[PDB]
């Protein structure tokens, strides 16, 4: 996260770290949506242009963390993966369309003060909140700038951007399964996700029921926190029928 701040303890208890077993390294963020299911970006697991194709046994998820590098004894919980599900129409060839994946844990994780699932949006909450100018929150342990790495989980609040401005900021073909967020050059304030934040959550706190909803997944961006560029996020509600189909079937 660029130009963010240290998270408070328990501020993002759905935050998940995707962790490579060997070598031991941060791969991506992710989020907890139930005691057995973790949501992330498909390109965190599958991206042939970079020879990336992780299997279940390659990975762990670490839940309840605050410190990036410490083993947080008695606080974090480490879970093995039972199965990875990637969206069948994830477009890694062109523009990361439908950049979404689910991971089923081998065993349910115990909830605690530090471990708790986020909600997924309904149609009405999505329609109400996914509006230009409305702010969401992005969290992660990724790099602090484009060109270093944080001691603890970082957090930044960022406004959703009008779709024409998102499109006009890039040569990539944008789809309805994406939205973009960030400040404009003329708005003064700054902030963005960066390398290592992919797969983590863009959340909003509903003013109707005071619950946190995951509206986006950190997906892609051109550099980090560049003037006139924006971060792009997987549109969770638009892909929710696939999410539910996977959970209902497996």
């Amino acid at each position: 996260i660029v130009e963010g701040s240290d998270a408070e303890i328990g501020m993002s208890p759905w935050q998940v770290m995707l962790f490579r077993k060997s070598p031991q390294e941060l791969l991506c963020g992710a989020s907890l949506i139930s005691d057995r299911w973790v949501l992330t970006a498909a390109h965190c697991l599958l991206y042939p242009p970079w020879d990336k194709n992780f299997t279940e046994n390659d990975l762990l998820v670490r839940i309840g963390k605050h410190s990036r590098t410490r083993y947080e004894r008695n606080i974090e919980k480490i879970s093995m993966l039972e199965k990875i599900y990637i969206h069948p129409r994830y477009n890694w060839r062109e523009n990361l369309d439908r950049d979404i994946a689910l991971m089923k844990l081998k065993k349910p994780v115990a909830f605690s003060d530090y471990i708790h699932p986020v909600c997924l949006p309904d149609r009405e909450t999505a329609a109400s909140l996914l509006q230009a100018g409305y702010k969401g929150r992005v969290t992660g342990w990724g790099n602090l700038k484009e060109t270093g790495q944080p001691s603890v989980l970082q957090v930044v609040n960022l406004p959703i951007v009008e779709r024409p401005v998102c499109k006009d900021s890039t040569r990539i073909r944008i789809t309805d399964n994406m939205f973009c967020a960030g400040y404009k050059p003329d708005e003064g304030k700054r902030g963005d996700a960066c390398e290592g934040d992919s797969g983590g959550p863009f959340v909003m706190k509903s003013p109707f029921n005071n619950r946190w909803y995951q509206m986006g997944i950190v997906s892609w961006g051109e550099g980090c926190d560049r003037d006139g560029k924006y971060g792009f996020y997987t549109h969770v509600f638009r892909l929710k029928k696939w999410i539910q189909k996977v959970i209902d079937q497996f």
Binding site: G10, S34, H116, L120
Partner: peptide, 28 residues
């Protein structure tokens, strides 16, 4: 989950975090 999105150390004890008000103020 019935309790999704309600954080044990914040919503569940009616404590606010230091910047959630910035989000609320943007929901105009």
């Amino acid at each position: 989950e019935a309790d999704c999105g309600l954080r044990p150390l914040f919503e569940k004890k009616s404590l606010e975090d230091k910047t959630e008000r910035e989000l609320l103020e943007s929901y105009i």
